[PDB]
């Protein structure tokens, strides 16, 4: 189950 | 009776103007389940196990969203990379991320990761803690100040706490004729005169889950850690795993030699002679 | 800029009784970067409808794929598994043989 927070540009 | 949740992301640019590549898969343990390819036909989260089938709509929405969500951090992140390295925008580079969590014997958070690297090393990780980071160069150390800002660790933390332990269990359960199946080791033994002299002798196992194993040889006592061949750990293609060890030995003293077995799924680890 | 040569596994994956139907599988791994070529070879010519699991990679970031098409072995047939990748400078060979 993806996560859908903390996932941001580097 | 551990397990896991990994997902695995690779991004890699074209030459140009070209979209990158995107392609993202799920595991749980050994066990591969989800895939999303941007060069494929569908455009969303496909299944790739038969149980995660019972998965209705909304689910497939959801992580169709949130994969194309992740896709787009990605496609900029290879914009930014290829300026923090200064590269000409000609040759093609890769960005891949890992996370997941782990749960025990019993079903309770264990430990969590979240790892991300450019060209094939280390640029930026989650720390054990879930806490703070480790960067891999002082343009990690840009990124890791822009995510502390952020709070991306306590962000990624929760998830990894809470949904991620809560999906792996719905998972554990919802395919467990599959996940929690134990699958010890079928053995056997080859033997193949090679030369006057000495013969090869060749342990098999086969058919095995998880992947997790030790194959090793040993004459009389000690070991023979050196003077063995010995190939990595395989898929079969049929969700179990292949490995073999192999070792030369003199024509008549293949007697003094025996391969040990050990997998989770056999009480006692096994150990083998040549007996024909 | 980290390259690495794949590893190369040309297997099948049942034991091979000859005229029985079978997969022949070529797992490829430990490389860097993704881009690869893998082709399943019968008697140095390509098996026709040959099928791959999805692009993954293992903690030392390098990468991994399994190609396996269905094949029934014979005495005579020869298979192999012929892989190419930029670390290479011409593709690389793997005769298959039923005891590895």
Same mark, same amino acid.
């Given at each position: 189950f993806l996560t859908g927070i903390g996932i941001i540009t580097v | 009776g551990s397990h896991s949740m990994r997902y695995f992301f690779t991004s890699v640019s074209r030459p140009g103007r070209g979209e990158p590549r995107?392609? @993202?898969?799920?595991?749980?343990?050994?066990?591969?389940?989800?895939?999303?390819?941007?060069?494929?036909?569908?455009?969303?989260? &496909?299944?790739? @196990?038969? !149980? *995660?089938?019972?998965?209705?709509?909304?689910?497939?929405?959801?992580?169709? #969203?949130?994969?194309? @969500?992740?896709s787009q951090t990605h496609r900029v992140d290879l914009g930014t990379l290829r300026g923090y390295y200064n590269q000409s925008e000609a040759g093609?580079?890769?960005?891949? #991320?890992?996370?997941?969590?782990?749960?025990?014997?019993? !079903? #309770?958070?264990?430990?969590?990761?979240?790892?991300?690297?450019?060209?094939?090393?280390?640029? *930026?990780?989650?720390?054990?803690?879930? #806490?703070?980071?480790?960067?891999?160069?002082? @343009?990690?150390?840009?990124?890791?100040?822009?995510? &502390?800002?952020?709070?991306?660790? &306590?962000?990624?933390?929760?998830?990894? &706490?809470?949904?991620?332990?809560? !999906?792996?269990?719905?998972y554990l359960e919802n395919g467990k004729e599959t996940l929690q199946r134990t699958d010890a080791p079928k053995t056997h033994m080859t033997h193949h005169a090679v030369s006057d002299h000495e013969a090869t002798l060749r342990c098999w196992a086969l058919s095995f889950y998880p992947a997790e194993?030790?194959?090793? !040889?040993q004459r009389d006592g000690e070991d023979q850690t050196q003077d063995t061949e010995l190939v990595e750990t395989r898929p079969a293609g049929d969700g179990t795993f292949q490995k073999w060890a192999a070792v030369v030995v003199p024509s008549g003293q293949e007697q003094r030699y025996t391969c040990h077995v050990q997998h989770e799924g056999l009480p006692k680890p096994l150990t083998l002679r040549w007996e024909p | 800029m980290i390259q690495r040569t794949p590893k190369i596994q040309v297997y099948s994956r049942h034991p091979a009784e000859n005229g029985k139907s079978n997969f022949l599988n070529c797992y490829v791994s430990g490389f860097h970067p993704s881009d690869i070529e893998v082709d399943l070879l019968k008697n140095g010519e390509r098996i026709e409808k040959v099928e791959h699991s999805d692009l993954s990679?293992?903690?030392?970031?390098?990468?991994?794929?399994?190609?396996?098409?269905?094949?029934?072995?014979?005495?005579?047939?020869?298979?192999?598994?012929?892989?190419?990748?930029?670390?290479?400078?011409?593709?690389?060979?793997?005769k298959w043989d039923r005891d590895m």
């Open positions: - | 995107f392609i @993202a898969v799920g595991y749980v343990d050994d066990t591969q389940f989800v895939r999303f390819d941007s060069d494929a036909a569908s455009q969303r989260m &496909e299944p790739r @196990a038969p !149980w *995660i089938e019972q998965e209705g709509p909304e689910y497939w929405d959801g992580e169709t #969203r949130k994969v194309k @969500a992740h093609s580079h890769t960005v891949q #991320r890992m996370y997941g969590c782990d749960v025990g014997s019993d !079903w #309770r958070f264990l430990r969590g990761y979240h790892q991300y690297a450019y060209d094939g090393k280390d640029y *930026i990780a989650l720390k054990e803690d879930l #806490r703070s980071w480790t960067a891999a160069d002082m @343009a990690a150390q840009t990124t890791k100040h822009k995510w &502390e800002a952020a709070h991306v660790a &306590e962000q990624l933390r929760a998830y990894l &706490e809470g949904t991620c332990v809560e !999906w792996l269990r719905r194993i030790t194959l090793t !040889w | 990679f293992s903690k030392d970031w390098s990468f991994y794929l399994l190609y396996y098409t269905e094949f029934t072995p014979t005495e005579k047939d020869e298979y192999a598994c012929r892989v190419n990748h930029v670390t290479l400078s011409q593709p690389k060979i793997v």
